[PDB]
Enzyme design. Structure first.
Site, PDB file in Angstrom:
ATOM      1  N   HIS F  17       0.819  -1.206   0.000  1.00  0.00           N
ATOM      2  CA  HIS F  17       0.000   0.000   0.000  1.00  0.00           C
ATOM      3  C   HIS F  17       0.856   1.260   0.000  1.00  0.00           C
ATOM      4  O   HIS F  17       0.581   2.202  -0.740  1.00  0.00           O
ATOM      5  CB  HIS F  17      -0.895   0.034   1.240  1.00  0.00           C
ATOM      6  CG  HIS F  17      -1.892  -1.071   1.286  1.00  0.00           C
ATOM      7  ND1 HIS F  17      -2.057  -1.870   2.402  1.00  0.00           N
ATOM      8  CD2 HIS F  17      -2.809  -1.486   0.381  1.00  0.00           C
ATOM      9  CE1 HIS F  17      -3.023  -2.740   2.170  1.00  0.00           C
ATOM     10  NE2 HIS F  17      -3.497  -2.533   0.956  1.00  0.00           N
ATOM     11  N   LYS F  41     -17.890  -6.150   8.391  1.00  0.00           N
ATOM     12  CA  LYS F  41     -16.603  -6.593   8.954  1.00  0.00           C
ATOM     13  C   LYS F  41     -15.935  -5.500   9.778  1.00  0.00           C
ATOM     14  O   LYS F  41     -15.720  -4.406   9.298  1.00  0.00           O
ATOM     15  CB  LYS F  41     -15.660  -7.077   7.864  1.00  0.00           C
ATOM     16  N   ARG F  90      -1.901  -6.489  -8.062  1.00  0.00           N
ATOM     17  CA  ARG F  90      -0.868  -7.530  -7.959  1.00  0.00           C
ATOM     18  C   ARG F  90      -1.440  -8.784  -8.575  1.00  0.00           C
ATOM     19  O   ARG F  90      -1.869  -9.685  -7.855  1.00  0.00           O
ATOM     20  CB  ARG F  90      -0.470  -7.855  -6.506  1.00  0.00           C
ATOM     21  CG  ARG F  90      -0.871  -6.874  -5.459  1.00  0.00           C
ATOM     22  CD  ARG F  90      -1.060  -7.485  -4.103  1.00  0.00           C
ATOM     23  NE  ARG F  90      -1.896  -8.660  -4.069  1.00  0.00           N
ATOM     24  CZ  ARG F  90      -2.801  -8.874  -3.131  1.00  0.00           C
ATOM     25  NH1 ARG F  90      -3.003  -7.946  -2.224  1.00  0.00           N
ATOM     26  NH2 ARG F  90      -3.516  -9.987  -3.120  1.00  0.00           N
ATOM     27  N   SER F 127      -3.003  -7.654   3.479  1.00  0.00           N
ATOM     28  CA  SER F 127      -3.328  -7.438   4.886  1.00  0.00           C
ATOM     29  C   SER F 127      -3.808  -8.743   5.514  1.00  0.00           C
ATOM     30  O   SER F 127      -3.359  -9.123   6.596  1.00  0.00           O
ATOM     31  CB  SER F 127      -4.392  -6.347   5.039  1.00  0.00           C
ATOM     32  OG  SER F 127      -3.946  -5.105   4.490  1.00  0.00           O
TER      33      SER F 127
HETATM   34  N1  VCC Z   1       0.463  -5.950  -1.787  1.00  0.00           N
HETATM   35  C1  VCC Z   1       0.183  -4.801  -2.559  1.00  0.00           C
HETATM   36  C2  VCC Z   1       1.231  -4.304  -3.314  1.00  0.00           C
HETATM   37  C3  VCC Z   1       1.054  -3.182  -4.099  1.00  0.00           C
HETATM   38  C4  VCC Z   1      -0.188  -2.579  -4.148  1.00  0.00           C
HETATM   39  C5  VCC Z   1      -1.241  -3.067  -3.405  1.00  0.00           C
HETATM   40  C6  VCC Z   1      -1.072  -4.178  -2.602  1.00  0.00           C
HETATM   41  N2  VCC Z   1      -2.260  -4.593  -1.931  1.00  0.00           N
HETATM   42  N3  VCC Z   1      -3.400  -4.631  -2.576  1.00  0.00           N
HETATM   43  C7  VCC Z   1      -4.391  -5.023  -1.791  1.00  0.00           C
HETATM   44  C8  VCC Z   1      -3.839  -5.268  -0.507  1.00  0.00           C
HETATM   45  C9  VCC Z   1      -4.547  -5.730   0.750  1.00  0.00           C
HETATM   46  O1  VCC Z   1      -4.090  -6.704   1.386  1.00  0.00           O
HETATM   47  O2  VCC Z   1      -5.572  -5.133   1.178  1.00  0.00           O
HETATM   48  C10 VCC Z   1      -2.452  -4.966  -0.665  1.00  0.00           C
HETATM   49  C11 VCC Z   1      -1.413  -5.060   0.436  1.00  0.00           C
HETATM   50  F1  VCC Z   1      -1.992  -5.398   1.592  1.00  0.00           F
HETATM   51  F2  VCC Z   1      -0.811  -3.868   0.554  1.00  0.00           F
HETATM   52  F3  VCC Z   1      -0.508  -6.003   0.160  1.00  0.00           F
END
Ligand code: VCC
Ligand code: VCC
Ligand code: VCC
Ligand code: VCC
Lengths: 157, 157, 154, 154, 157, 157
Positions: F17, F41, F90, F127
Site C-alpha cells: 500500500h 466486517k 498484484r 493485509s
Molecule cells: N500488496 C500490494 C502491493 C502493491 C499494491 C497493493 C497491494 N495490496 N493490494 C491489496 C492489498 C490488501 O491486502 O488489502 C495490498 C497489500 F496489503 F498492501 F498487500
C-alpha cells in the site's frame, strides 16, 4: 431451421474438434464446418485433404456438411443464410482472444458466437502440438481420429 | 424441435441477461429461462417478482418462456426434453469456473453448455454489483431494464 | 533423503487428489499427506482413513492431521517442500501468493503439478453438491470414499 | 535415486532461471539442465558455459544440450520429471498443455515452481532488448553472464 | 507541472486510444502522445500519417501534444522531464504482459506506469484487428475516429 | 490542481500500500487516502488506529492526507473536488475484478481509476495473509511498515 458454422484450419482435425462438431450437430438443424484456406500459411495438409479427413470422421452426422472458406468469416456465414458460429474453448486465455473476435464479428455483421467447453480428455490437444510431437516420433494416435493418424504418418515419411 | 435453457438466479435480471436471452431465442426453436431458487436463501426479490421482471422485458420474444426451479439444473433441463444450457460470459475467470460446472453437467447427465460473450456495454454489469451500488445511492438505471429499476429502488426503501 | 508434504482439507479426497499423491510419491522418497483442520462433511479421522485406504499401494506415503501454519508442519518433520495440484491459471495466481509467502517466512518451497485432464472439473465441493441432489459422482472418487459419501447423505 | 530436468533456451540464463535451478537442486538428488537447440544471441556452447559458471556451487547439477522431444531427453537419462519456473497464470495455461501432452505420450511428469518475487519481470528476451538500448540489466543476470552480454553488443 | 506520456505504435490510432488520451489529459497537467516507430518495420501508416490522424482527433485537448520516437520509452519520458506513462488495458492477460514491462521500466529508470481500464464499448477494438477486418471488407467505421477510417480504406485500395 | 483518492480498508496498511501511496503522491498534486469503514466486517484495527498507522508511514508525503470514508466511494471522491481513484494491482485476476468496479464507477459518476503495478517485492503481501501468518507466529516484519509491526504484535497478545 436453425444452424451454425464451425470454423477452423483443421490441419489436421483432432478428436477435440470432432467433439465440438458432434455437439453442434446435436443442437442445430444444420452445421457447416468451414475449412479456412490461408494463402499465407500453407500447412501440412491441403484443403481437400483436410475436408476429406473431416468427412470421414463425421460420416454419422447427416446434418453436418464440410466446405472450404476464404476471407471474412462473417461473410461465409451470412452467404449461407446463417448467423451463428460455434467454436470450442480449452482455457480462459482462449476465451479472451476469442471474445474480442466474437464481439467484433457481432459488431460488423450481427453474427453470434457460441462457445463450448472442451471435453476434459482433449484439453491439451491441438493440431500444432500433435504435428510437432508426431514429427519426432511421439505417439498421438489417441488424440486424432483414425482417419487422420494414418494419413499423418504418411506425410511424415 | 431445438431448444435451450438459460439459467440464473436473476435477482434481478440485468440488461446483460436480457441480451443473452435474445441471442438464445434467435438461435434455438424454444428457450426456457430457468429461475433457480435457493430454498435456504431468500434473495432481494421473490420468485414471483423475478419472473415478472423477466417476462415484462421479454414480451417480444415469442419462443421464450420463464419457469422457476431448484436442485440440479440438469434435471430441469432433461425433464423438459432438452439437452442444452446457454449462458453468458464476461471474463476468462468466468470461463474457468463455468467450464468446471459445464464439464460436470455433461459428465453426470449428458447436457451440453453453450457460452456467449457478453455485449461489450454490459461487461461490468452484475446483479450483485447493481444491488450494491443502488444500496448506496448510485444510479444504475442504464444497466437494468425498465421492469427492474424502480422495483429495485422500492425494495431498498 | 528427499520429501514433500501434500496439504489439503480433503473433504473428501478425490481421484484428482489421489493422482497428485501418486505423482508426488513417484518423485520424492517421502510423502506426507497433511489433512488440515480448519467445518464440513467428514471428520479429520474419517478423512485420514479414506486417504490411507486409497493410498495402500504407496509405501512411502503417510497421512497425518495438521493445524496452524503449514510451514511449521512441514519443517517440524524435517522437510521444506510442498506439492500441490493445480487446475487453472486462476488456481496458480492464488497459490502463487501463498507459495511466495511460505518461502519468505520459512524457506519452504512449493512444487505444483497440473491436474490430470480427466479430473479438470472435479472438486470435493462440487462432488458433494452434486451427490447431495442425486447426481452420480462414482467415477470421480475412490471406490471406498464413494460408499462412505452415500452413507453420510442417508 | 530422484531426479529432474530443467529445460529452456537460456539465451542467456537469468537470475530467475538460476533461482529455479537451485530450488530444483535442493529437492532432487540429480538435476540436469537441458539447453535446447531450436536462432538467437548466444551459441549452445556459450549458453552451457554461462550456466555451468553460474552453478558451480550446485554439486548435483549438470548441463547438457538437447534436441528433439524433451521427453526423450528426459527418459534417455533414466528420469521422468521436468522442473520449470512460472511467473503468471497465463504461463501456467500454456505450460499445462505441454505438461499434459508430455505425461500422455511418455509418462514424464512436470513440477512447476513460482518465480521469486524479485524476478517477476525478468526474461531473457526483455533483458536482451533493454540492454541493446543501453538499459542497465546487471541486477537481473549472473555476474558472468552480464559481462558476456556487453561483449556481444559491442 | 504534472505530466504523463501515452505510448503506442498507433497504426492507426483507435477510439480506444483516444479514450485513454482524453482521460490522461483530464488528470495530468500535460500529456504527450509518443508515437513509437520501429525503424526496421514499416507499419501501414507513415509516422507523419500516424501523427496527423492523432492530432485531428485530439484538437479539443489543449494540454496534449504528439511526438514520435524510437528506442527505450523510458528515455523518451525522462528527456521531457517526466516520470509517468499512461496506458490502457482491456484484459488480465494485457495486465500480465504490461506489468512485466512496467516493472522493468521502473527498475531501469524509475519511471512509473498508470493503467486505465478500457471503455466497455472499445474492449474488442485493436489496431491490428481493425486492419485485418478492413482488409477483408468488414465495416470498422465505428471503431476508428473520422480522421482514420477513409485513410485506412485508401491504404487498402 | 490534480488529485486522486487511494481507497482501501488498510487493516493494516502494508508496504505494498505504502508503495502505491508514494507513487501516487509523486504524480498528483494531492492524494487522499480513504480508509473505508465497514459496519459489516469490523477487522483487527479500528479506523482511527488504521489512520494513525498510515499517517506515521506517510509522514514524508506532504501532499497526501488520510481520512475515513463510508458508503459509495465515488461520492467520497466527488465531494472533495476530485474525480480519480488510484489503486495497486498484484496480478491479472485482480485486474478483472477491479475492472468491473472501475467501469461501474466511471459509468455512475464519471470518476476515473488509475492502476499501478505492485512493486515486485510485495506481489504476495496482503493485509489478510499478513494477519493470518502473524497470528500463528510467522514473521511478517519485512512486509509491513515499522509502525504497523509493533502495533500488530500488541493486538495479537
Ligand atoms: N500488496 C500490494 C502491493 C502493491 C499494491 C497493493 C497491494 N495490496 N493490494 C491489496 C492489498 C490488501 O491486502 O488489502 C495490498 C497489500 F496489503 F498492501 F498487500
Ligand atoms: N482440443 C480441442 C478440444 C475441444 C475443442 C477444440 C479444440 N481445439 N481448439 C483449437 C484446436 C486446434 O489445434 O486448432 C483444437 C484441437 F486441435 F482440436 F485440439
Ligand atoms: N453482465 C452479463 C452480460 C452478459 C451475460 C451475462 C451477464 N451476466 N453474467 C453474470 C451476471 C451476474 O449477474 O452474475 C450477469 C448479469 F447479471 F446479467 F449482468
Ligand atoms: N482498445 C483499447 C481501449 C482502450 C485503451 C487501449 C485500447 N487499446 N489497447 C490496445 C490497443 C491496440 O491497438 O493494441 C488498443 C486500441 F488499439 F486502441 F484499440
Amino acid at each position: 431451421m436453425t444452424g451454425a458454422v464451425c470454423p477452423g484450419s483443421f490441419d489436421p482435425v483432432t478428436l477435440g474438434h470432432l467433439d465440438v462438431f458432434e455437439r453442434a450437430a446435436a443442437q442445430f438443424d444444420e452445421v457447416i464446418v468451414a475449412v479456412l484456406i490461408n494463402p499465407n500459411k500453407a500447412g501440412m495438409f491441403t484443403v481437400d485433404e483436410r475436408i476429406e479427413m473431416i468427412r470421414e470422421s463425421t460420416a454419422d452426422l447427416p446434418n453436418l456438411r464440410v466446405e472450404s472458406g476464404q476471407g471474412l468469416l462473417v461473410d461465409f456465414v451470412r452467404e449461407r443464410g446463417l448467423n451463428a458460429i460455434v467454436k470450442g474453448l480449452r482455457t480462459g486465455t482462449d476465451f479472451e482472444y476469442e471474445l474480442q473476435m466474437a464481439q467484433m464479428n457481432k459488431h460488423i455483421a450481427g453474427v453470434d458466437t457460441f462457445f463450448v467447453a472442451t471435453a476434459p480428455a482433449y484439453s491439451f490437444v491441438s493440431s500444432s502440438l500433435a504435428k510437432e510431437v508426431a514429427t519426432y516420433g511421439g505417439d498421438v494416435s489417441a488424440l486424432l481420429p483414425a482417419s487422420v493418424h494414418q494419413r499423418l504418418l504418411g506425410k511424415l515419411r
